[PDB]
């Protein structure tokens, strides 16, 4: 609704539940997508990320062509304050994850 088509920058702070989201994808022609946002966790309270966002970068590490494992390591090692570049692609998310 107030989500643009182009990539956006979101800053999250890591908590006791991590970043408060989980990821799928990173294989074939599917990039890294947010599949779940934990209620009350850091991503949810930020208000800015959505299921079906593709993660393009985290703290400058390019995740456009990462595998799931590569992305999970980048997110684990990104530190307490994490800058995410995300692009909202709900139709492409549904093609892969429906």
Short description, anyone?
This protein is an alpha+beta fold and 98 residues long. It has three helices and six strands.
Description:
22% of the residues lie in helices and 38% in strands. It is of the alpha+beta class. The protein has one domain (1-98): Pdz3 Domain (Roll), CATH 2.30.42.10. It is globular and about 30 Å long. This is Disks large homolog 4.
CATH fold node name: Pdz3 Domain
Structural class: alpha+beta
Give the distance, in angstroms, between the N- and C-terminal Cα atoms.
Answer: 22 Å
What portion of residues belong to β-strands?
Answer: 35-45%
Question: Helicity range of the residues?
Answer: 10-25%
| Strands, count | 6
Order of helices and strands: EEEHEEHEH
Query: What is the number of independent domains?
Result: 1
Shape: globular
- Please outline the major beta sheet: 4 strands, antiparallel
Going by CATH, the architecture would be Roll
Read across the widest sheet, the strand sequence of neighbours is 1-6-4-5
**Going by CATH, what is the homologous superfamily?**
PDZ domain
The top level CATH class name: Mainly Beta
Organism: Homo sapiens
Family: Belongs to the MAGUK family.
Protein name: Disks large homolog 4
Domain PDZ: 9-89
């Amino acid at each position: 609704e107030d989500i643009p088509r182009e990539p956006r920058r979101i800053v999250i702070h890591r908590g006791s539940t991590g970043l408060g989201f989980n990821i799928v994808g990173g294989e074939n022609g599917e990039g890294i997508f947010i599949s779940f946002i934990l209620a009350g966790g850091p991503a949810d309270l930020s208000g800015e990320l959505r299921k079906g966002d593709q993660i393009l970068s985290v703290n400058g590490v390019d995740l456009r062509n990462a595998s799931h494992e590569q992305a999970a390591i980048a997110l684990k090692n990104a530190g307490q304050t994490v800058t995410i570049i995300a692009q909202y692609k709900p139709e492409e998310y549904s093609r892969f994850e429906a």
